[PDB]
Amino acid sequence: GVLKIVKVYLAVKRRIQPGDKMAGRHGNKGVISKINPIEDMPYDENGTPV
Amino acid sequence: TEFLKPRLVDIEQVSSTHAKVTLEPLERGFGHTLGNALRRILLSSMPGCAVTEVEIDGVLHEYSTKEGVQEDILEILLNLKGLAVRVQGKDEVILTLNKSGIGPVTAADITHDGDVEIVKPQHVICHLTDENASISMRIKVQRGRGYVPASTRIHSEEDERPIGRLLVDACYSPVERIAYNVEAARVEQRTDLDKLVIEMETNGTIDPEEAIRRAATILAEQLEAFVDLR
Numbered sequence: 001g002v003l004k005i006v007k008v009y010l011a012v013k014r015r016i017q018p019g020d021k022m023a024g025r026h027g028n029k030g031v032i033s034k035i036n037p038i039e040d041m042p043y044d045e046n047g048t049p050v
Numbered sequence: 051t052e053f054l055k056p057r058l059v060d061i062e063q064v065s066s067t068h069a070k071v072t073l074e075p076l077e078r079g080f081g082h083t084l085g086n087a088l089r090r091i092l093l094s095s096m097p098g099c100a101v102t103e104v105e106i107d108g109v110l111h112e113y114s115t116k117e118g119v120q121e122d123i124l125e126i127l128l129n130l131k132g133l134a135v136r137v138q139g140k141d142e143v144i145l146t147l148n149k150s151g152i153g154p155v156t157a158a159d160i161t162h163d164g165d166v167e168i169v170k171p172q173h174v175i176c177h178l179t180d181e182n183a184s185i186s187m188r189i190k191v192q193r194g195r196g197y198v199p200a201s202t203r204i205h206s207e208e209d210e211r212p213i214g215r216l217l218v219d220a221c222y223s224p225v226e227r228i229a230y231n232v233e234a235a236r237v238e239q240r241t242d243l244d245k246l247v248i249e250m251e252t253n254g255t256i257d258p259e260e261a262i263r264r265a266a267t268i269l270a271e272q273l274e275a276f277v278d279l280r
Contacts, residue, residue: 011113015201039090047229047249 056080059245061259067226067251069258074245081246085230086245088248091158091265094196098256099137100220101130102203103190105212112216118183119176127178127218130189133157134169134254141193147175150184160189170256192276194222224256 016022018032041049062070062133076084104127108116112123121129134157137143143166149159155178158171176185198220231247250258 011111013201015199037094039093043229045225045229045231 052077054243056246063258066254069250071248071250071258072233072245072264073241073248075237075243076235076246078242081230081232081244085232085246085248086241087269088262088265089230091268092248092250094223096223096225096261096265096269097114097193097225098197098222098253099135099191099193100198100222101133101135101189101218102192102194102198102220104130104187104216104218105190105214106185106187106216108186109216110214116185118178118180119185120179120254121176123216128215129173129175131218131221132193132253133175133189135191136167136169136255137165137191137193138167142157144188144190146188148184148186149178150181151178152181153178159278166191190210191193192220194220195226196223197221224252225250225261226253227251258276 014020016035018030018034020032021029022032023029027040051053051138054075056069056073056076059074060070060072063070063071063122064070073084106116109123112127116124118206119126125216126175135145143163145160145163145166147155147160154174155176156171157168157173157175159175160168162168178185200217200219203217203220229246231249233245233247237243250261252261
């Protein structure tokens with residue numbers, strides 16, 4: 001039945017967002033809840049944000 | 051009202067990227083008041099220029115491979131995001147880069163415009179391995195503020211759709227790191243009154259003193275509304 005086939009390849013570039021699942025290596029799961037702005041994040045006396 | 055205003059004392063510029071700025075005398079509690087409120091404007095609100103569009107010849111998309119080049123096109127785009135550029139007159143400049151032969155393609159290979167300064171000329175963009183290989187591209191630098199991703203920019207404009215134009219995440223804000231501190235002032239007899247050291251770590255373009263001046267201007271413009279309109 002098949003006369004010819006065209007296979008198309010797309011490339012999606014998905015960045016992280018709330019809902020995406022992350023983890024470490026000790027079975028510590030988690031879901032992103034909010035991308036907090038750099039201005040709002042905690043920072044040490046040195047000044048470098050977490 | 052015992053209004054006691056600070057004044058800009060010393061700007062210890064250790065490097066063109068990293069510079070301390072001491073501030074005294076501040077009345078009790080104003081050290082942290084301005085310190086954080088400024089840090090926030092200096093992180094997010096500082097205007098700067100950043101590579102928005104790139105268009106390489108022999109390249110239909112960023113995922114393809116160019117012959118005679120070590121880096122994949124994505125890794126070249128990455129290097130162009132961190133390209134230090136200062137446009138003096140216009141808001142948008144489209145620079146041309148044609149280069150060939152065996153050599154690490156540096157920022158100096160770009161044709162500089164009458165009113166465009168490439169701040170780090172030795173900045174690496176691409177590595178040409180083959181002598182026969184030649185690279186050609188058109189780098190659009192626009193001015194904006196903060197950080198504008200390519201995923202946020204592919205969901206707004208899109209009026210002209212030229213096949214062969216790679217959009218790049220814009221790193222407009224020039225301030226990379228900033229952290230204010232507090233030290234002894236040792237003035238006349240104020241004692242309690244101290245100073246405020248604002249340590250800024252930026253790219254090339256935006257000058258430490260100039261940047262703090264702009265950031266205080268932005269805060270004063272927001273305060274117009276709280277002074278004028280009650």
